[PDB]
Each structure stands twice: as C-alpha cells, then as structure tokens.
Design a protein around this ligand. Structure first.
Ligand SMILES: Cc1cc2nc3c(=O)[nH]c(=O)nc-3n(C[C@H](O)[C@H](O)[C@H](O)COP(=O)(O)OP(=O)(O)OC[C@H]3O[C@@H](n4cnc5c(N)ncnc54)[C@H](O)[C@@H]3O)c2cc1C
Length: 430
C-alpha cells in the first residue's frame, strides 16, 4: 500500500490531509499534542492562498469562509502615519494618503483555532493519531521505507514523510541537523502587538472616514494596520515594532512560550510617540496588559531544498516567513496543493520504489522552492519599506507605491492552476 505520513496537524498538515482524502490517497497525521489546541491568533489569507484552498477541495475554502471576516472590499489605504495633518483630533484631521493597494479577489482573516476546527470536521478520526511526538526518522532495513519514531517509544511506517511540524520542525532537524549553523528560523527583528476593539468605539475616537476601510500607517521604525472587520463588528489593530536587539531564548517545546512575552504597556506608546494622532489614538486602544509576538523567519539560514529521500518539509517547517504580505500559512496551503497532486499520481501507481517516492518529493521542491524563498525575502523587505528603514517613504509615495504594488502582484496573482500542471509535467519527466 502507498502510505503518506503527515507530521503535524497545523494549517499546512490539515489542509494537505483534506487534499489527500479527496484524492483517495492513504495518509495518517501524527500530532505531538493531545488535540490541536485552541491558539486564537489571527491569520490573514490572501487571494492566492484562497485559490489553493479551493484547488485542494472546495470544503477547504468553505472551512475558511465559514469563519473568516473582512472589511468592505479589497482596497487598503497606505498612509504616512507621522504627517497626518489638520488637528490633534483624528475625527477632523486629514490622513496623509500615499497610495491605495487594491487586492484582487480580496483577503480575509480568521482565528487559527476556528479554521482548524472547521477543517478537522472533514478528516476521519481514524486518520489522526494524537500524542505522537516525532523524534526521529530512520530507514527500514528490510523494506527501505521510512520508520517514524515517537517519544512514546512507538514506531510507524510510511512511503513518504511530510514535515508539517512548524517553525521548530523536528523533521527539518532530521534532514539538515541541529548545530549552530543549521537551517533554522531566527528573529526577524519585528515584534507584533495586536488587539481587537469594538468597532463603534474605534469610530467614536477616529471618526467614520478612518474606520471605513483598511489602513496601513507607515512611519519610522514601526507600522500599524487598522482593519475594520465587518462580520465581527470589531476594529483589528495590528502593530509591528522593529527591535534591533536579540530575542531572549527560552528552553521550551511551546512556541507560545518561545516567541511571546508580556508587554509592558509603554512599549507601544514609546514606539509610536512621534506619529500622528490617528496612530497614537489607535495604539492607546490596546489593553493596558498585552503580549508581544517575536516574529521569526528563515531568511538568513534557509533550508537548501524541501526534500531529501523519502522526507520533505511544507509550511513553516520549510519557509517560515514574516506576515507582512499576508500570513505565511498561505504558502503552506500552496505547498499542500502541490503535494496532494503529486502524491495522487504515486498513490495510483502499481508499485512505488524508494527512488520514485524520493523523486516525487524532489519535484515538489523544484516547483515550490524559489517562490517560497522569494516570499520570505519579499515579506521582510515589505516590513523594511513600511518602517522607513532605508528612506523616508512618506516623502516618496509614488516610488513606494510601485514597489508594493509589484511585489503584491507577484504574490497574490500567482497562476495556481499552472503550478499544478507544471508539477505534473516535471513529475512525468522524473
Ligand atoms: C504565538 C504565535 C503567534 C502567531 N501569530 C501569528 C500571526 O499573528 N499571524 C500569522 O500569520 N501567523 C501567526 N503565527 C503562525 C501561524 O500559527 C502559522 O504560520 C500557521 O499555523 C501555519 O503553520 P504550519 O501549519 O506550517 O505549522 P504550525 O502551525 O506550527 O503547526 C505545526 C503542528 O505540528 C505539531 N508538531 C510540532 N512538532 C511536532 C513533532 N515533532 N511531532 C509531531 N507533531 C509536531 C505542532 O504541535 C502543531 O500542531 C503565530 C504562531 C504562534 C506560535
């Protein structure tokens, strides 16, 4: 039988599992936790990601749309957060508009746990094994198949292993090692502060014009998004502050404990003190108690490939990214689509040698590697533009606009269907 082991039931692994289910490919999800938890973080999914969801199966996109929210329409206003003019009262000030970014096909955000809960409904219970904390991968002496070994002391067998086990992937460690110079995520030097406030309260402070649309407020060393989310009657305020310092290292298997700290209330206040009243007002709407999220990415120490032998990486295990152009989870869905399509070809074949399995995964990598690396770099650059790292873009709006629009187009208007046919063509070759 041809068996796919998916290590990790995050967004990437769950999306892949549904794609395989709907293509009649045998798989098992091995998840280290007792359940998929309840992490509430908000993830924004872009058009390219929504197309890949649909292509996996319409129920993946439906799972998403059932729990997602958005502003009215797909236009985002990019403003200069410093040089708002006219008043200290945002209700009568004039936002300093740089340009508008129109998102063809729109974007939506959801709580991660809500999307997880919808997707999991579509996966049979007998396809998910909890408390399976993958520790190592070896090769079976008799068969040459992968042997998974879990911390509970048990093993499993598979023809291919898909590491969907996130930013601190054990599958990645198995492939490429753990030493100080190994592929790994590192701090991107950006801290996330975010909150939701009742939409009517935001309108009372900022006025209706400034709560009518999504706005990204650029400025020196930090930026903030104010996004009115209609279906939840809330204004989402998402600030990112650049931090030249290192992130303190904590020994923990919990990614929350690794990448989150309590935030002293004055941190956001200080970062935005030189901004205009709209930004200072928005930031003041954060709860006095909040958390900060240290964003890590794989820009500096990327993996050299997504596949080795019968093992591969997808999602944040492969290409953890800053979220400056949308949640990096979107690319886990693109990865999942390619894997679903290639693995369906193997699942149909009378026999699949280790060579053919390995070549299949290599094809997956050939199709996704360059684009995936591009996102990690482009997203980091986007942060640099929005925080005026190199130049005051408040004073060069037209230039800024050309740069952001171009990179947005390459990401969001990607040929999803062509990616699949490319994969199947190359698979043929190999
Ligand atoms: C605190 C925090 C805040 C975040 N905030 C944001 C945000 O604001 N915006 C945004 O876009 N993204 C955010 N993210 C990231 C987002 O959750 C992920 O990008 C998204 O879930 C896609 O990642 P993934 O599915 O590839 O992997 P993950 O979501 O990391 O899923 C990995 C899964 O594999 C399991 N696993 C790990 N190791 C093993 C192992 N050895 N054996 C078995 N199972 C294993 C994990 O338990 C988990 O279920 C945040 C993440 C964290 C931790």
């Amino acid at each position: 039988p041809f068996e796919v082991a998916i290590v990790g039931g995050g967004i990437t692994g769950l999306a892949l599992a549904v794609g395989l289910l709907k293509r009649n490919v045998s798989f098992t999800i091995y998840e280290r936790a007792e359940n998929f938890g309840e992490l509430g973080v908000g993830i924004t999914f872009t058009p390219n990601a929504q197309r890949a969801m649909e292509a996996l199966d319409p129920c993946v996109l439906q799972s998403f749309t059932n729990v997602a929210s958005a502003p009215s329409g797909g236009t985002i206003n990019f403003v200069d957060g410093v040089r708002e003019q006219g008043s200290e009262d945002p209700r009568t000030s004039t936002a300093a508009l740089l340009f508008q970014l129109h998102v063809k096909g729109g974007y939506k955000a959801c709580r991660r746990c809500d999307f997880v809960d919808q997707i999991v409904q579509h996966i049979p219970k007998d396809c998910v094994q909890y408390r399976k904390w993958l520790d190592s991968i070896e090769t079976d002496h008799e068969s040459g198949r992968a042997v998974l070994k879990f911390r509970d002391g048990e093993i499993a067998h598979a023809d291919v292993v898909i590491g969907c086990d996130g930013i601190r992937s054990q599958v990645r460690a198995s492939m490429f090692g753990t030493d100080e110079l190994c592929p790994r995520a590192q701090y991107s030097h950006q801290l996330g502060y975010r909150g939701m406030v009742p939409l009517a309260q935001a309108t009372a402070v900022l006025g209706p014009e400034k709560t009518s649309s999504a706005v990204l407020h650029t400025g020196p060393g930090a930026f903030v998004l104010t996004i009115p989310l209609a279906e939840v009657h809330a204004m989402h305020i998402e600030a990112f502050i650049m931090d030249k310092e290192e992130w303190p290292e904590v020994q923990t298997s919990s990614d929350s404990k690794r990448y989150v700290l309590p935030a002293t209330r004055n941190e956001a206040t200080k970062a935005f003190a030189e901004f205009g009243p709209t930004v200072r007002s928005a930031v003041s709407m954060f709860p006095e108690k909040l958390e900060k999220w240290a964003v890590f990415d794989m820009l500096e120490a990327p993996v050299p490939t997504f596949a080795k032998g019968r093992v591969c990486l997808a999602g944040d295990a492969a290409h953890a990214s800053t979220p400056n152009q949308g949640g990096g989870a979107g690319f886990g869905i693109e990865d999942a689509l390619v894997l679903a399509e290639v693995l369906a070809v193997l699942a149909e074949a009378p026999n699949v040698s280790g060579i053919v399995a390995s070549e299949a995964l290599a094809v997956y990598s050939e199709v996704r590697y360059e684009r995936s690396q591009w996102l990690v770099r482009s997203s980091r650059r986007t942060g640099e533009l929005c925080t005026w790292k190199d130049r005051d873009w408040g004073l060069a709006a037209e230039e800024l606009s050309r740069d952001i629009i171009s990179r947005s187009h390459q990401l969001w208007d990607h040929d999803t269907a062509g990616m699949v046919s490319d994969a199947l063509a190359i698979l043929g070759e190999r």
